[PDB]
Design a protein around this ligand. Structure first.
Ligand SMILES: Cc1nn(C)c(C)c1NC(=O)CC#N
Ligand SMILES: [Zn+2]
Length: 140
């Protein structure tokens, strides 16, 4: 589980979005496993705006933050999972590391702030849904 809280936005894995999230929808994209809902309270999480391929992620299934190298966001074939069929997930970054389904929503952070959230895993790879291209999370 886990979210990003920036301005009047809450950024969650689309597959973990609540009824309250869908009742307060701003933007969702199934191909990226992202959903953004409206917040009453201002958020102050800083979104990275950068090209970084090094950072740190939170892994709930180890209670540990791990430093990783990761690929730039891309369209990647992800084995069938419980919530998406076998498919191209878009805007996905991969790193060598541990992840289990409930790690979804752990933050990946670089020197510039929040890069993304844990979304895919298996075969020793963890995938993160990028948010750095979502420039509108900054404004309005
Ligand atoms: C973070 C992660 N690690 N692993 C092994 C898998 C399958 C995931 N993602 C999901 O299961 C999301 C769905 N459906
Ligand atoms: Zn960065």
């Amino acid at each position: 589980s886990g979210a990003i809280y920036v301005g009047n936005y809450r950024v969650v894995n689309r597959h973990l979005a609540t009824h309250n999230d869908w009742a307060n929808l701003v933007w969702e994209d199934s191909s990226r496993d992202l959903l953004v809902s409206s917040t009453t309270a201002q958020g102050c999480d800083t979104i990275a705006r950068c090209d970084c391929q090094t950072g740190v992620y939170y892994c709930s299934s180890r209670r540990k933050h791990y430093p990783v190298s990761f690929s730039k966001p891309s369209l990647i074939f992800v084995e069938a999972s419980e919530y998406y069929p076998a498919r191209y997930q878009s805007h996905l970054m991969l790193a060598v590391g541990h992840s289990e389904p409930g790690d979804c929503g752990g933050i990946l952070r670089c020197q510039h702030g929040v890069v993304g959230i844990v979304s895919t895993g298996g075969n020793g790879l963890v995938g993160f849904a990028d948010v750095r291209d979502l420039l509108w999370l900054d404004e309005e």
